Paper text:
Botulinum neurotoxins (BoNTs) are a family of bacterial toxins produced by diverse strains of anaerobic clostridial bacteria. BoNTs are classified into seven major serotypes (BoNT/A–G). They are produced as ~150 kDa proteins, composed of a ~50 kDa light chain (LC) and a ~100 kDa heavy chain (HC). The HC contains two functional domains: the translocation domain on the N-terminal half (HN) and the receptor-binding domain on the C-terminal half (HC). BoNTs target neurons with exquisite specificity, which is achieved by recognizing two receptors in a “double-receptor” model.
The LC and HN of BoNT/DC are almost identical to the corresponding regions in BoNT/D, while its HC is most similar to BoNT/C1-HC. To identify the potential moiety on gangliosides recognized by BoNT/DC, we sought to determine the X-ray co-crystal structure of BoNT/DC-HC in complex with Sialyl-T. Co-crystallization of BoNT/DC-HC with Sialyl-T yielded crystals diffracting to 2.6 Å, with space group P41212. The complex contains two molecules per asymmetric unit (ASU), with well-defined electron density for Sialyl-T. Due to crystal contacts, Sialyl-T bound to chain A in the crystal is highly ordered, whereas the other Sialyl-T bound to chain B has much weaker electron density in the parts of Sialyl-T not interacting with BoNT/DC-HC. No significant differences were observed in the interactions between Sialyl-T and BoNT/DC-HC between the two Sialyl-T molecules, so from here on all data we report are based on the well-defined Sialyl-T molecule bound to chain A. The structure revealed that Sialyl-T binds to BoNT/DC-HC with a total of seven hydrogen bonds, all originating from the terminal sialic acid. There are two hydrogen bonds to S1242, one each to N1114, Y1115, I1240, and S1275. An additional hydrogen bond is formed with Y1243 via a bridging water molecule. The location of the Sialyl-T binding site in BoNT/DC is homologous to the well-defined GBS site in other BoNTs. The major difference is that this site in BoNT/DC forms contacts with only the sialic acid, but not the Gal-GalNAc, whereas the conserved GBS site in other BoNTs interacts with all three moieties. Essentially, the GBS in BoNT/DC has “degenerated” into a sialic acid-binding site.
Residue numbers in the entry: 864 to 923, 927 to 1033, 1036 to 1050, 1060 to 1284
The structure:
Amino acid sequence: INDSKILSLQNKKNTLMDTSGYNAEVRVEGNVQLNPIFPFDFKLGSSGDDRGKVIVTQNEYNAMYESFSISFWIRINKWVSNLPGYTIIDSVKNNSGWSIGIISNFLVFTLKQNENSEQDINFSYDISKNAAGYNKWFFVTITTNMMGNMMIYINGKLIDTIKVKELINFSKTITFQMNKIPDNINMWIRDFYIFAKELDDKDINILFNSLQYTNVVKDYWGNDLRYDKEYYMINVNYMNRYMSKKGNGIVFNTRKNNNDFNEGYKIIIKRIRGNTNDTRVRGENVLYFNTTIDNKQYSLGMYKPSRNLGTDLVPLGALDQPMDEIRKYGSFIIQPCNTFDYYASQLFLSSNATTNRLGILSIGSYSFKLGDDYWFNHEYLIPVIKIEHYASLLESTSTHWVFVPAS
Ligand SMILES: CC(=O)N[C@@H]1[C@@H](O[C@@H]2O[C@H](CO)[C@H](O)[C@H](O[C@]3(C(=O)O)C[C@H](O)[C@@H](NC(C)=O)[C@H]([C@H](O)[C@H](O)CO)O3)[C@H]2O)[C@@H](O)[C@@H](CO)O[C@H]1O
Protein backbone atom coordinates (compact mmCIF):
# COMPACT_ATOMS: atom_id res chain seq x y z
CA ILE A 1 0.00 0.00 0.00
CA ASN A 2 1.65 3.20 -1.27
CA ASP A 3 -0.04 5.51 1.33
CA SER A 4 2.68 4.51 3.84
CA LYS A 5 5.67 5.24 1.55
CA ILE A 6 7.93 7.82 3.26
CA LEU A 7 11.00 7.52 1.00
CA SER A 8 11.20 6.64 -2.67
CA LEU A 9 14.68 6.86 -4.19
CA GLN A 10 14.51 6.88 -8.01
CA ASN A 11 16.30 8.02 -11.14
CA LYS A 12 14.04 10.69 -12.66
CA LYS A 13 15.26 12.34 -15.89
CA ASN A 14 18.80 11.31 -14.94
CA THR A 15 18.70 12.68 -11.39
CA LEU A 16 18.37 10.72 -8.17
CA MET A 17 15.61 12.14 -6.00
CA ASP A 18 12.99 11.28 -3.43
CA THR A 19 9.63 10.95 -5.23
CA SER A 20 7.56 10.06 -2.11
CA GLY A 21 6.36 13.59 -1.30
CA TYR A 22 8.55 13.89 1.82
CA ASN A 23 11.43 15.47 -0.19
CA ALA A 24 14.57 14.07 1.40
CA GLU A 25 17.81 15.63 0.19
CA VAL A 26 19.75 13.31 -2.11
CA ARG A 27 23.43 14.07 -2.75
CA VAL A 28 25.53 12.18 -5.30
CA GLU A 29 29.34 12.22 -5.07
CA GLY A 30 32.14 10.46 -6.96
CA ASN A 31 31.78 7.69 -9.55
CA VAL A 32 28.03 7.03 -9.64
CA GLN A 33 26.57 5.92 -12.98
CA LEU A 34 22.84 6.25 -13.66
CA ASN A 35 21.18 3.94 -16.19
CA PRO A 36 19.13 5.98 -18.68
CA ILE A 37 16.91 2.98 -19.58
CA PHE A 38 14.82 0.66 -17.38
CA PRO A 39 15.26 -0.34 -14.62
CA PHE A 40 16.88 3.12 -14.12
CA ASP A 41 19.45 1.79 -11.67
CA PHE A 42 22.42 3.51 -10.10
CA LYS A 43 25.81 1.85 -9.99
CA LEU A 44 28.58 2.04 -7.37
CA GLY A 45 31.99 0.37 -7.18
CA SER A 46 34.49 -0.42 -4.42
CA SER A 47 37.68 0.98 -6.03
CA GLY A 48 39.15 4.48 -5.52
CA ASP A 49 38.68 7.47 -3.22
CA ASP A 50 36.28 8.79 -5.86
CA ARG A 51 34.44 5.55 -5.14
CA GLY A 52 30.80 6.61 -5.44
CA LYS A 53 28.55 7.87 -2.68
CA VAL A 54 24.82 8.60 -2.37
CA ILE A 55 23.76 10.43 0.82
CA VAL A 56 20.04 10.59 1.61
CA THR A 57 19.17 13.02 4.40
CA GLN A 58 15.58 12.84 5.63
CA ASN A 59 13.57 16.00 6.09
CA GLU A 60 12.08 17.43 9.36
CA TYR A 61 9.71 11.87 9.12
CA ASN A 62 11.59 9.85 11.74
CA ALA A 63 8.52 10.55 13.95
CA MET A 64 7.15 7.39 12.24
CA TYR A 65 9.42 4.54 13.42
CA GLU A 66 7.64 2.01 15.58
CA SER A 67 7.13 -0.15 12.49
CA PHE A 68 8.92 0.28 9.17
CA SER A 69 9.88 -1.60 6.03
CA ILE A 70 12.82 -1.24 3.66
CA SER A 71 12.56 -2.49 0.10
CA PHE A 72 14.92 -2.39 -2.89
CA TRP A 73 16.31 -4.15 -5.94
CA ILE A 74 20.02 -4.95 -5.77
CA ARG A 75 22.68 -6.65 -7.87
CA ILE A 76 26.28 -7.40 -6.88
CA ASN A 77 29.09 -8.56 -9.20
CA LYS A 78 31.16 -10.61 -8.67
CA TRP A 79 29.48 -11.77 -5.43
CA VAL A 80 31.85 -14.65 -4.68
CA SER A 81 31.64 -16.98 -1.65
CA ASN A 82 34.92 -15.68 -0.13
CA LEU A 83 33.95 -12.01 -0.42
CA PRO A 84 35.49 -9.76 2.26
CA GLY A 85 33.22 -7.75 4.57
CA TYR A 86 31.61 -4.61 3.13
CA THR A 87 29.15 -2.07 4.44
CA ILE A 88 26.97 -1.01 1.50
CA ILE A 89 23.94 0.86 2.92
CA ASP A 90 24.48 2.57 6.29
CA SER A 91 22.12 4.48 8.56
CA VAL A 92 24.05 4.40 11.83
CA LYS A 93 24.73 7.56 13.84
CA ASN A 94 26.33 7.73 17.31
CA ASN A 95 26.28 3.92 17.70
CA SER A 96 22.61 3.34 16.83
CA GLY A 97 20.35 2.97 13.79
CA TRP A 98 20.56 0.22 11.16
CA SER A 99 23.03 -1.06 8.60
CA ILE A 100 23.18 -3.36 5.55
CA GLY A 101 26.42 -5.19 4.77
CA ILE A 102 27.71 -8.16 2.84
CA ILE A 103 30.37 -10.76 3.66
CA SER A 104 31.10 -14.13 2.05
CA ASN A 105 27.69 -15.34 0.72
CA PHE A 106 25.75 -13.28 3.30
CA LEU A 107 23.68 -10.13 3.05
CA VAL A 108 23.07 -8.91 6.59
CA PHE A 109 20.63 -6.38 8.05
CA THR A 110 21.74 -5.07 11.43
CA LEU A 111 19.51 -3.27 13.90
CA LYS A 112 21.87 -1.42 16.25
CA GLN A 113 20.54 -0.21 19.64
CA ASN A 114 23.85 0.74 21.37
CA GLU A 115 27.59 0.23 21.06
CA ASN A 116 27.05 -2.96 23.15
CA SER A 117 23.70 -4.29 21.90
CA GLU A 118 22.90 -5.16 18.28
CA GLN A 119 20.79 -7.71 16.36
CA ASP A 120 20.99 -9.06 12.83
CA ILE A 121 19.16 -11.16 10.29
CA ASN A 122 20.50 -12.37 6.98
CA PHE A 123 20.13 -14.02 3.61
CA SER A 124 22.86 -16.49 2.68
CA TYR A 125 22.71 -17.53 -0.97
CA ASP A 126 22.91 -21.16 -2.01
CA ILE A 127 26.54 -21.62 -3.15
CA SER A 128 25.76 -24.95 -4.86
CA LYS A 129 23.41 -23.19 -7.31
CA ASN A 130 25.70 -20.19 -7.94
CA ALA A 131 29.15 -21.59 -8.67
CA ALA A 132 30.14 -18.40 -10.52
CA GLY A 133 28.82 -16.04 -7.80
CA TYR A 134 25.34 -14.67 -7.04
CA ASN A 135 25.51 -11.96 -9.68
CA LYS A 136 21.77 -11.67 -10.35
CA TRP A 137 19.23 -8.99 -9.50
CA PHE A 138 17.27 -9.79 -6.36
CA PHE A 139 14.56 -8.01 -4.42
CA VAL A 140 15.17 -7.36 -0.74
CA THR A 141 12.40 -6.58 1.73
CA ILE A 142 13.14 -5.95 5.40
CA THR A 143 10.25 -5.41 7.82
CA THR A 144 10.82 -4.33 11.41
CA ASN A 145 8.39 -4.09 14.32
CA MET A 146 9.95 -2.56 17.46
CA MET A 147 7.36 -4.37 19.62
CA GLY A 148 7.44 -7.50 17.46
CA ASN A 149 9.57 -9.15 14.79
CA MET A 150 12.40 -8.20 12.48
CA MET A 151 12.22 -10.03 9.15
CA ILE A 152 13.98 -10.29 5.80
CA TYR A 153 12.44 -11.46 2.53
CA ILE A 154 14.21 -12.21 -0.75
CA ASN A 155 12.17 -12.18 -3.96
CA GLY A 156 8.99 -12.15 -1.87
CA LYS A 157 9.87 -15.27 0.14
CA LEU A 158 10.52 -15.05 3.92
CA ILE A 159 14.09 -16.04 4.85
CA ASP A 160 14.89 -15.08 8.45
CA THR A 161 12.99 -13.79 11.51
CA ILE A 162 14.09 -12.64 14.96
CA LYS A 163 12.25 -11.12 17.92
CA VAL A 164 13.41 -7.55 18.57
CA LYS A 165 14.95 -6.75 21.97
CA GLU A 166 12.41 -4.59 23.80
CA LEU A 167 14.57 -1.67 25.00
CA ILE A 168 16.65 2.84 19.77
CA ASN A 169 17.68 6.12 18.04
CA PHE A 170 17.36 6.29 14.24
CA SER A 171 19.67 8.27 11.97
CA LYS A 172 18.28 10.83 9.54
CA THR A 173 20.96 9.87 7.03
CA ILE A 174 21.26 6.90 4.70
CA THR A 175 24.58 6.43 2.95
CA PHE A 176 24.99 4.16 -0.08
CA GLN A 177 28.71 3.45 -0.35
CA MET A 178 30.81 0.30 -0.67
CA ASN A 179 33.09 0.47 2.37
CA LYS A 180 35.44 -2.41 3.12
CA ILE A 181 35.84 -3.59 6.71
CA PRO A 182 39.58 -3.47 7.69
CA ASP A 183 38.99 -8.26 -6.44
CA ASN A 184 37.00 -5.03 -7.03
CA ILE A 185 33.19 -5.29 -7.01
CA ASN A 186 30.23 -3.40 -8.43
CA MET A 187 26.76 -2.85 -7.04
CA TRP A 188 23.51 -1.78 -8.72
CA ILE A 189 20.44 -0.45 -6.89
CA ARG A 190 16.99 0.66 -8.04
CA ASP A 191 13.66 1.57 -6.43
CA PHE A 192 14.84 1.93 -2.85
CA TYR A 193 11.66 2.48 -0.78
CA ILE A 194 10.93 2.96 2.92
CA PHE A 195 7.42 2.40 4.30
CA ALA A 196 6.14 3.64 7.67
CA LYS A 197 4.51 0.29 8.50
CA GLU A 198 5.24 -3.43 8.68
CA LEU A 199 4.43 -4.88 5.25
CA ASP A 200 2.92 -8.39 5.27
CA ASP A 201 3.54 -11.36 2.95
CA LYS A 202 0.78 -10.43 0.50
CA ASP A 203 1.78 -6.75 0.13
CA ILE A 204 5.44 -7.68 -0.39
CA ASN A 205 4.59 -10.01 -3.29
CA ILE A 206 2.27 -7.43 -4.84
CA LEU A 207 5.13 -4.95 -4.54
CA PHE A 208 7.64 -7.49 -5.90
CA ASN A 209 5.62 -8.06 -9.09
CA SER A 210 4.52 -4.44 -9.60
CA LEU A 211 8.18 -3.47 -10.16
CA GLN A 212 8.78 -6.00 -12.98
CA TYR A 213 7.66 -6.38 -16.57
CA THR A 214 6.52 -9.98 -16.02
CA ASN A 215 6.29 -10.80 -19.73
CA VAL A 216 9.80 -9.58 -20.57
CA VAL A 217 12.05 -12.65 -20.42
CA LYS A 218 15.25 -12.22 -18.39
CA ASP A 219 18.84 -13.43 -18.80
CA TYR A 220 20.56 -15.35 -15.97
CA TRP A 221 21.53 -12.11 -14.16
CA GLY A 222 17.95 -10.72 -14.26
CA ASN A 223 18.54 -8.20 -17.04
CA ASP A 224 16.23 -8.10 -20.07
CA LEU A 225 16.82 -10.93 -22.55
CA ARG A 226 17.64 -9.56 -26.02
CA TYR A 227 17.70 -10.68 -29.67
CA ASP A 228 20.89 -10.50 -31.76
CA LYS A 229 23.12 -10.97 -28.71
CA GLU A 230 25.52 -13.77 -27.84
CA TYR A 231 24.51 -15.98 -24.89
CA TYR A 232 25.54 -19.24 -23.31
CA MET A 233 22.40 -21.40 -23.31
CA ILE A 234 22.36 -23.61 -20.22
CA ASN A 235 19.83 -26.00 -18.64
CA VAL A 236 18.95 -25.51 -14.96
CA ASN A 237 19.53 -29.21 -14.16
CA TYR A 238 23.04 -29.12 -15.64
CA MET A 239 24.58 -25.76 -14.79
CA ASN A 240 28.04 -27.39 -14.78
CA ARG A 241 27.80 -28.20 -18.51
CA TYR A 242 28.52 -26.14 -21.63
CA MET A 243 27.21 -26.52 -25.19
CA SER A 244 29.29 -28.44 -27.71
CA LYS A 245 28.72 -30.32 -30.97
CA LYS A 246 29.22 -33.79 -32.38
CA GLY A 247 28.06 -34.40 -35.92
CA ASN A 248 24.78 -32.63 -36.35
CA GLY A 249 23.92 -33.09 -32.61
CA ILE A 250 24.32 -30.62 -29.77
CA VAL A 251 25.95 -32.28 -26.79
CA PHE A 252 26.60 -30.98 -23.31
CA ASN A 253 30.10 -31.30 -21.83
CA THR A 254 31.39 -30.88 -18.27
CA ARG A 255 33.01 -27.52 -17.46
CA LYS A 256 36.72 -27.20 -16.72
CA ASN A 257 36.22 -23.72 -15.17
CA ASN A 258 33.22 -24.08 -12.85
CA ASN A 259 33.68 -20.67 -11.22
CA ASP A 260 32.73 -18.85 -14.42
CA PHE A 261 30.94 -19.12 -17.77
CA ASN A 262 33.42 -19.00 -20.65
CA GLU A 263 33.25 -22.38 -22.39
CA GLY A 264 31.56 -23.92 -25.41
CA TYR A 265 29.60 -22.42 -28.26
CA LYS A 266 27.45 -19.30 -28.11
CA ILE A 267 23.91 -18.88 -29.40
CA ILE A 268 22.19 -15.80 -30.79
CA ILE A 269 18.42 -15.52 -30.43
CA LYS A 270 16.58 -14.45 -33.61
CA ARG A 271 13.08 -12.91 -33.68
CA ILE A 272 10.30 -14.26 -35.91
CA ARG A 273 7.27 -12.83 -34.07
CA GLY A 274 7.37 -9.97 -31.57
CA ASN A 275 7.54 -6.25 -30.95
CA THR A 276 9.93 -4.43 -33.31
CA ASN A 277 10.20 -1.15 -31.34
CA ASP A 278 12.92 -2.73 -29.23
CA THR A 279 15.16 -5.78 -29.08
CA ARG A 280 13.74 -7.33 -25.87
CA VAL A 281 12.44 -10.90 -25.82
CA ARG A 282 8.86 -11.43 -24.63
CA GLY A 283 6.57 -14.28 -23.68
CA GLU A 284 4.68 -15.71 -26.68
CA ASN A 285 7.29 -14.34 -29.07
CA VAL A 286 8.34 -16.99 -31.58
CA LEU A 287 12.03 -17.28 -32.38
CA TYR A 288 14.94 -19.48 -33.44
CA PHE A 289 18.58 -19.90 -32.39
CA ASN A 290 21.77 -19.40 -34.41
CA THR A 291 25.22 -20.57 -33.40
CA THR A 292 28.64 -20.06 -34.99
CA ILE A 293 30.88 -23.16 -35.05
CA ASP A 294 34.28 -23.21 -36.82
CA ASN A 295 33.27 -19.95 -38.56
CA LYS A 296 30.16 -21.54 -40.15
CA GLN A 297 26.76 -20.29 -39.01
CA TYR A 298 24.35 -23.07 -38.07
CA SER A 299 20.85 -22.97 -36.67
CA LEU A 300 19.29 -25.22 -34.01
CA GLY A 301 16.71 -27.74 -35.24
CA MET A 302 15.31 -31.24 -34.92
CA TYR A 303 17.01 -34.18 -36.61
CA LYS A 304 16.38 -37.90 -36.94
CA PRO A 305 18.54 -39.89 -34.49
CA SER A 306 20.41 -43.18 -35.17
CA ARG A 307 17.67 -44.95 -33.23
CA ASN A 308 14.44 -44.22 -31.40
CA LEU A 309 15.52 -42.54 -28.15
CA GLY A 310 12.08 -43.05 -26.62
CA THR A 311 8.41 -42.37 -27.28
CA ASP A 312 7.72 -38.79 -28.48
CA LEU A 313 11.42 -37.75 -28.16
CA VAL A 314 13.32 -35.88 -30.88
CA PRO A 315 16.84 -34.50 -30.31
CA LEU A 316 17.76 -30.89 -31.05
CA GLY A 317 20.92 -30.31 -33.11
CA ALA A 318 23.01 -27.76 -35.01
CA LEU A 319 22.12 -27.83 -38.69
CA ASP A 320 23.01 -25.89 -41.84
CA GLN A 321 19.31 -25.55 -42.63
CA PRO A 322 17.55 -23.04 -44.88
CA MET A 323 14.88 -20.79 -43.42
CA ASP A 324 11.97 -23.10 -44.36
CA GLU A 325 13.57 -25.95 -42.33
CA ILE A 326 14.01 -23.58 -39.36
CA ARG A 327 10.31 -22.79 -39.68
CA LYS A 328 9.31 -26.45 -39.57
CA TYR A 329 11.97 -27.92 -37.30
CA GLY A 330 13.66 -25.17 -35.24
CA SER A 331 11.18 -22.43 -34.29
CA PHE A 332 10.20 -21.95 -30.66
CA ILE A 333 7.68 -20.14 -28.50
CA ILE A 334 9.26 -18.63 -25.40
CA GLN A 335 7.63 -18.11 -22.02
CA PRO A 336 9.33 -16.61 -18.96
CA CYS A 337 9.88 -18.90 -15.97
CA ASN A 338 11.26 -17.16 -12.89
CA THR A 339 11.91 -19.01 -9.62
CA PHE A 340 13.41 -17.88 -6.32
CA ASP A 341 16.69 -19.45 -7.50
CA TYR A 342 16.95 -18.33 -11.13
CA TYR A 343 15.71 -16.26 -14.04
CA ALA A 344 14.79 -18.77 -16.75
CA SER A 345 12.47 -19.55 -19.65
CA GLN A 346 10.51 -22.43 -21.12
CA LEU A 347 10.73 -23.18 -24.83
CA PHE A 348 7.92 -24.85 -26.75
CA LEU A 349 8.33 -26.22 -30.27
CA SER A 350 6.36 -24.01 -32.64
CA SER A 351 4.10 -25.44 -35.33
CA ASN A 352 5.40 -23.70 -38.48
CA ALA A 353 6.42 -20.49 -36.63
CA THR A 354 2.93 -20.00 -35.22
CA THR A 355 2.08 -19.65 -31.54
CA ASN A 356 0.69 -23.23 -31.61
CA ARG A 357 2.78 -25.51 -29.36
CA LEU A 358 3.74 -29.04 -30.50
CA GLY A 359 6.21 -29.99 -27.74
CA ILE A 360 8.55 -28.79 -25.00
CA LEU A 361 12.35 -28.48 -24.99
CA SER A 362 13.89 -30.63 -22.24
CA ILE A 363 17.23 -32.37 -21.67
CA GLY A 364 18.45 -35.91 -21.10
CA SER A 365 21.09 -38.60 -21.31
CA TYR A 366 20.60 -40.95 -24.25
CA SER A 367 22.77 -43.62 -25.82
CA PHE A 368 23.01 -43.38 -29.60
CA LYS A 369 25.36 -42.52 -32.51
CA LEU A 370 26.59 -39.05 -33.52
CA GLY A 371 29.36 -37.82 -35.83
CA ASP A 372 31.82 -40.56 -36.71
CA ASP A 373 30.18 -43.10 -34.36
CA TYR A 374 29.64 -46.36 -36.23
CA TRP A 375 30.06 -49.58 -34.19
CA PHE A 376 28.69 -48.50 -30.77
CA ASN A 377 26.17 -46.24 -29.09
CA HIS A 378 27.54 -43.66 -26.67
CA GLU A 379 25.98 -41.68 -23.88
CA TYR A 380 25.30 -38.07 -24.84
CA LEU A 381 23.62 -35.42 -22.73
CA ILE A 382 21.48 -33.62 -25.28
CA PRO A 383 18.69 -31.09 -25.64
CA VAL A 384 15.60 -33.08 -26.54
CA ILE A 385 12.02 -32.16 -27.54
CA LYS A 386 9.12 -34.07 -26.01
CA ILE A 387 6.35 -33.96 -28.62
CA GLU A 388 2.59 -33.83 -27.91
CA HIS A 389 2.42 -35.77 -24.60
CA TYR A 390 4.53 -33.36 -22.51
CA ALA A 391 2.07 -32.53 -19.71
CA SER A 392 4.21 -34.15 -16.97
CA LEU A 393 7.24 -32.07 -18.02
CA LEU A 394 5.46 -28.68 -17.64
CA GLU A 395 6.39 -28.54 -13.94
CA SER A 396 9.75 -30.24 -14.55
CA THR A 397 12.86 -28.22 -13.93
CA SER A 398 14.55 -29.92 -16.94
CA THR A 399 12.54 -27.56 -19.16
CA HIS A 400 13.97 -24.42 -17.52
CA TRP A 401 16.58 -22.77 -19.77
CA VAL A 402 18.78 -19.80 -18.86
CA PHE A 403 20.86 -17.45 -20.99
CA VAL A 404 24.18 -16.07 -19.68
CA PRO A 405 25.64 -13.10 -21.64
CA ALA A 406 28.83 -14.11 -23.43
CA SER A 407 29.93 -10.51 -24.42
C1 LIG B 1 14.02 -43.09 -13.16
C2 LIG B 1 14.91 -42.85 -12.02
O1 LIG B 1 14.46 -42.51 -10.99
N1 LIG B 1 16.20 -43.01 -12.19
C3 LIG B 1 17.15 -42.61 -11.20
C4 LIG B 1 17.93 -41.41 -11.66
O2 LIG B 1 17.08 -40.39 -12.04
C5 LIG B 1 17.74 -39.69 -13.04
O3 LIG B 1 18.85 -39.03 -12.53
C6 LIG B 1 19.60 -38.36 -13.48
C7 LIG B 1 20.88 -37.95 -12.82
O4 LIG B 1 21.88 -38.90 -13.11
C8 LIG B 1 18.78 -37.18 -13.90
O5 LIG B 1 18.69 -36.27 -12.82
C9 LIG B 1 17.40 -37.62 -14.35
O6 LIG B 1 16.54 -36.52 -14.40
C10 LIG B 1 16.12 -35.97 -15.71
C11 LIG B 1 17.26 -35.13 -16.23
O7 LIG B 1 18.07 -35.61 -17.02
O8 LIG B 1 17.41 -33.97 -15.87
C12 LIG B 1 14.81 -35.15 -15.90
C13 LIG B 1 14.41 -34.92 -17.31
O9 LIG B 1 13.07 -34.59 -17.24
C14 LIG B 1 14.45 -36.14 -18.15
N2 LIG B 1 14.28 -35.70 -19.50
C15 LIG B 1 13.23 -35.93 -20.24
C16 LIG B 1 13.31 -35.46 -21.62
O10 LIG B 1 12.26 -36.47 -19.86
C17 LIG B 1 15.78 -36.83 -17.98
C18 LIG B 1 15.78 -38.12 -18.79
O11 LIG B 1 14.70 -38.94 -18.40
C19 LIG B 1 17.06 -38.91 -18.65
O12 LIG B 1 18.12 -37.99 -18.70
C20 LIG B 1 17.27 -39.87 -19.78
O13 LIG B 1 18.41 -40.67 -19.57
O14 LIG B 1 16.01 -37.06 -16.60
C21 LIG B 1 16.76 -38.63 -13.43
O15 LIG B 1 15.70 -39.29 -14.07
C22 LIG B 1 18.88 -40.93 -10.58
O16 LIG B 1 18.24 -40.76 -9.35
C23 LIG B 1 19.81 -42.07 -10.32
C24 LIG B 1 20.75 -41.76 -9.22
O17 LIG B 1 21.09 -42.99 -8.64
O18 LIG B 1 19.02 -43.17 -9.93
C25 LIG B 1 18.20 -43.66 -10.96
O19 LIG B 1 17.58 -44.66 -10.29
